[PDB]
């Protein structure tokens, strides 16, 4: 046995990050280098949850002032603390 060779949906948690990295390479080549994407990890899930929770305490934090789609989820809950 070696296995039944994973599908795209069965592949994940490594192939997800891989698939993301390849999509970013696609976007950067099709742009020419006028975008400059940052690290998708750092922040991870729990670090970001604590960073947004600090704004609900009532003080701003790292991404605040007075994984690439995470910004789209992020703004909806960021606006409440600001």
């Amino acid at each position: 046995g070696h296995r039944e060779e994973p599908y795209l949906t069965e592949a994940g948690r490594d192939a997800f990050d891989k698939f993301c990295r390849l999509h970013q390479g696609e976007l950067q080549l099709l742009a020419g280098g006028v975008l400059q994407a940052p690290q998708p990890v750092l922040v991870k899930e729990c670090e970001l949850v604590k960073d947004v929770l600090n704004v609900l305490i009532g003080v701003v934090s790292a991404t605040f002032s007075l994984p690439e789609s995470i910004s789209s989820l992020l703004s909806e809950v960021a606006e409440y603390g600001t």
Binding site: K50, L53, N54, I57, V59, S61
Partner: protein
């Protein structure tokens, strides 16, 4: 603080001259100022380098001492030893979520 020491003596003086039967009025003893008989409310490691599950226990235990008006261990009571003002300094390198 300093303004009281004046008033107290003068309020004494009004009542020695108005009463001709006032007898042997007190002087406030000197030792109460030289030695503490009025105010009784007046190792140190950086908390940021410590593990987490020691940082929580330590910061709670130290702030409980600090509240009374005197130094704890890792949070210090800044010296004024007087008026309605008092400030406390927790260590600056404490993790931001806990320190706020």
């Amino acid at each position: 603080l300093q303004q009281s020491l004046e008033l107290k003596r003068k309020m004494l003086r009004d009542k020695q001259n108005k009463k001709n039967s006032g007898q042997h009025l007190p002087i406030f003893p000197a030792w109460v100022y030289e030695r503490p008989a009025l105010i009784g409310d007046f190792t140190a490691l950086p908390i940021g380098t410590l593990p987490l599950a020691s940082q929580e226990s330590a910061v709670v235990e130290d702030l409980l001492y600090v509240l009374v008006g005197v130094d704890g261990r890792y949070v210090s009571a800044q010296p004024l030893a007087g008026r309605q003002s008092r400030t406390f300094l927790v260590d600056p390198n404490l993790d931001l979520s806990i320190r706020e």
